[PDB]
């Protein structure tokens, strides 16, 4: 029995998400102190995100960008940082290196987009912008989504300095020094990734699909906030608890 | 018991991943493009 | 895109009193406000940057404070020769959006 | 002081409804018949999750890492029949007993929920991938020397997506409370016809429970069965 | 002395195209950006855009995206705005601002070209 | 010889570096576990094989 009716049952919390707060922001912070913003309980339009041509290293892994509007996700964890112009290959699952291992690590089962633009007018001063920062020397390989905000002095060879910088003692947090005379491998990249999760929580945040009023016991093709299937909707006596 | 248990095993192997990102067909169809999603379907095809 | 309203629009004040005026933003601007004046026929002059700190070289008859979206500044000693329309300036999200202005009037 | 939990510390694994089936899962659970710590209050480690039991003497809870306003720290107070949850940078007292809720600064999250409550209040707190989950029931009891026998699976009430490093907790001629610890062991759960979890077993506790968990039923017959491999 | 000298009062037809000036001296012109603002007489400050002082790309605000062009000339410290195809709603005074890439607090200082349109 | 090789790509004996003294590789003790039970209706007493 083919479905003779397709119904849409997205929730109607019609207030929009603050992607303008996330994307159009003055101060994206550094890769050692990348900012997390929780996006929930709103309608999120990703068509203006994909249709904007300012991005050049988009590369959404696991979810295709055109078919992204019609599912509904549990949570958006908007991470945002500024890196060098050759380290977006480090911002990917599987790849290891300086930015990937010692600054920000993605999960191996990562599902999300790697949205970034190239900003040379904004984040480069003639002379060098010196508080955009990155960590080289660290005695711990980071598990994904970790915070290394500590400014402890690193000891390498034998004797611990423990509070001073000197022989075999390097400070971990060193500046980029972004100048506009640099090439495209040294230009600032403002990388803002959107980590999602499919099945861990209630599905909340998604696109502007217009909901359709429900119909009864004829076999229909339903869309209940991201799960698509064909079947018969019938009244039930199953005591669903509110979680 | 053996026939119903083999039927229950055949039902319960539908929820297996076999290396996929998800085991249900409609979710891996609905958020992926077809020319990248064909091998993603095909792993579940050969496992089932 | 930050729809900033500020209240009250036209308020009266007297000599040597203490008055409190507020500037409100719709979205989160959590610690970024800059405060201006507008005398007629004069370019604006900055007082308070990042909503707490004051600029060097201003007469300190005032202070600024606040957190979240509820921001204010308080005149601790008012003088009649100011009568300036106070302007608030956000610096968190583009575009840089200003306020309408609270015009100070003497009786 | 040490005592034993009987069948407590069970909850709902995946926030999902099941009926008249037996489901096997792998999740952080309190083991059956393990040594749980009884107190009649110093700061205690949270580790991988805590089972809490209590029997208006009992008040709210604090959660944190160092409690010295360097890391975000949870604070729950049930005041004026209106619970307020804050995550701000408080400084804890040396002997906390409004000084506990002092200096609410650098706040990132605040939440207001519905109020709750010879009685037992068993709570489960768990932190998995930055998600702080609170499980709650109220159940009358008639045993003060120890933990009463019986089964009651804990339903989640408010889920917190906070995402901090959690290490420690504390509880604000008195009452008594129980502390249990959670371990990653496999459980088999019996969902009843009306949606409640009537019974469960812990698969790694007993070879009999290994047969119950491998055979996927709570009743095995006489005979021989193979469950796992000893290496 | 740090000041921003601004051109005189323009008065033209609704449809002409003029070019006001903002000439700066005293500070490092390369270090800071070159913000701009308008004054409707019954309203307040309204921003249009920043200009990087090494290349000069004309990025604007989200409202005034159209016919408005900023043209910076390097090494002479001139920061010309060119307004083209003026309308009757552009009866505003256009101050000039020093607004950097990092700081974004103004200390705005301009004499103000009295652009009256009729 | 530096190593001895058993059937189907498993290594049986290796001579050691810095000493050249011959060693045998035997795998560690393994086996399945088994449960003798009279049934949960009768008793919970368990013999383990
Ligand atoms: C972040 O900022 C960008 C930059 O403005 C926003 O993009 C959109 O950009 C276009 C042109 O670049 C603008 O659209 C405008 O639409 C109105 C009505 O259709 C039209 O009359 C104008 O002439 C102009 O074309 C506008 O700046 C903006 N569109 C909006 C805000 O709807 C972008 O939307 C911002 N937000 C995010 C989440 O990226
Ligand atoms: C998030 C929210 O409040 N959504 C409401 C919904 O509950 C209500 O049924 C509907 C009709 O008034 O309006 C909308
Ligand atoms: C059946 O559901 C009712 C709900 O009113 C509940 O009170 C009862 O305990 C349930 N039965 C069992 C055996 O759990
Ligand atoms: C358990 O065993 C006794 C005697 O062996 C028998 O009478 C009883 O019916 C059994 N229980 C069940 C549930 O079959």
Residue numbers in the entry:
A (entry chain B): 320 to 562
B (entry chain C): 953 to 1000
C (entry chain Q): 1 to 107
D (entry chain C): 27 to 66, 81 to 95, 99 to 140, 157 to 176, 187 to 241, 261 to 319
E (entry chain O): 1 to 118
F (entry chain C): 563 to 611
Give passages from the manuscript.
To reveal the binding epitope of hu33, we investigated the complex formed by the fragment antigen-binding (Fab) regions of hu33 and a prefusion-stabilized Beta S trimer using single-particle cryo-electron microscopy (cryo-EM), and reconstructed a cryo-EM density map for the one RBD open state at an overall resolution of 3.1 Å. The binding site of hu33 on Beta RBD is reminiscent of S309. However, when compared to S309, hu33 moves up towards the RBD neck region that engages ACE2. Further structural analyses suggest that the hu33 Fab binds largely outside of the ACE2 site, although a few clashes may occur between their side chains if they bind together on one RBD. To investigate the breadth of hu33 neutralizing activity, SARS-CoV-2 S proteins-bearing vesicular stomatitis virus (VSV delta G/luciferase) pseudoviruses infection of Huh7 cells model was employed. hu33 had shown high potency against prototype SARS-CoV-2 with a median neutralization dose (ND50) of 3.3 ng/mL, consistent with its efficacy of 12.5 and 4.7 ng/mL to Beta and Delta variants, respectively. Despite a nearly 46-fold potency reduction compared with that to wild-type SARS-CoV-2, hu33 still neutralized Omicron at an ND50 value of 154.3 ng/mL. In summary, this study showed that the Omicron variant escapes most EUA Class I/II NAbs, whereas the neutralization sensitivity of Class III mAbs, non-ACE2-blocking antibodies, was less affected by this variant.
